[PDB]
């Protein structure tokens, strides 16, 4: 998964 907000996507 990419783009911004990626780290906290979950």
């Amino acid at each position, epitope marked *: 998964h*990419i*783009g*911004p*907000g*990626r*780290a*906290f996507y979950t």
Partner: antibody, heavy 121, light 112 residues
Framework: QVKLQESGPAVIKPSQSLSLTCIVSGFSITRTNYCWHWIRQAPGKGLEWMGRICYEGSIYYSPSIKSRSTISRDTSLNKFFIQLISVTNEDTAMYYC?????????????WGQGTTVTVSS | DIVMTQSPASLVVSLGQRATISCRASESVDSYGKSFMHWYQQKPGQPPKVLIYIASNLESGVPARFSGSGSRTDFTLTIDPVEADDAATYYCQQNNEDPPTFGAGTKLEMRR
């Protein structure tokens, strides 16, 4: 407003653990969206990324220092750290910590002054 | 990871002239319809400062003679006209996918 300051040992013996502390100030490491990063710049070379710890505690490590470091943080004191075990000359560099609005912007907008660390006897 | 390669590795541009630094990525740094790559500048003994973000946007405070453009895998930072104050190293970074990677920098030294 925000201010970040790196604290750490000016000199450290080879094969010993280096641990720096970044004291965020005038802003907190738990506000949503932001991620806090560690970046170093070996002298006379380019910037090099190391790892980040995001507001909700999520952590990511540069592969190269992944097997020999841990990024933790202290919610109470409002500051995050990094430890590199068994340092070597390759570890002499300038270390900075900064902030990213991970959710919208994605670029590091506030950087600390970055302390210097020299691995030596 | 996406490797960012900058070119030239260093250049001497004369005052008033224009300098065209470029940054290329091994793989597209695109998502949500934008290019997530920024440009920093680093005067000596100074942490880098953002100049341009998300490919073409200018950070406040940065003069209008700076301007980047490009998409997917080809990006360019242009400084026209160079000014005494631009003598520094410039980096490009991708933050579209992990781990975020930087470029090796382009040292601009200008002629007087």
């Amino acid at each position: 407003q925000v201010k970040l300051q790196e604290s750490g040992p000016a000199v450290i013996k080879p094969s010993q653990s280096l641990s720096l502390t970044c004291i965020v100030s005038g802003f907190s490491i738990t506000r949503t969206n932001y991620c806090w990063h560690w970046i170093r710049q070996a002298p006379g070379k380019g910037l090099e990324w190391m790892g980040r710890i995001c507001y909700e505690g999520s952590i990511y490590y540069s592969p190269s220092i992944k097997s020999r470091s841990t990024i933790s943080r202290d919610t109470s004191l409002n500051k995050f750290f990094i430890q590199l075990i068994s340092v070597t000359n390759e570890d002499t560099a300038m270390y900075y910590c900064s902030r990213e609005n991970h959710m919208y912007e994605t670029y590091f907008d506030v950087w600390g002054q970055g302390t210097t660390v020299t691995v030596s006897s | 990871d996406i490797v960012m390669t900058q070119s030239p590795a260093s250049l001497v541009v004369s005052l008033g002239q224009r300098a065209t630094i470029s940054c290329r990525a091994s793989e597209s740094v695109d998502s949500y319809g934008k290019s997530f790559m920024h440009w920093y500048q680093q005067k000596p003994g100074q942490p880098p400062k953002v100049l341009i973000y998300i490919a073409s946007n200018l950070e406040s405070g940065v003069p209008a003679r700076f301007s980047g453009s490009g998409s997917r895998t080809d990006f360019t930072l242009t400084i026209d006209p160079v000014e005494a104050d631009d003598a520094a190293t410039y980096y490009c970074q991708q933050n579209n996918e992990d781990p975020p990677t930087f470029g090796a920098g382009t040292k601009l030294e200008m002629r007087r």
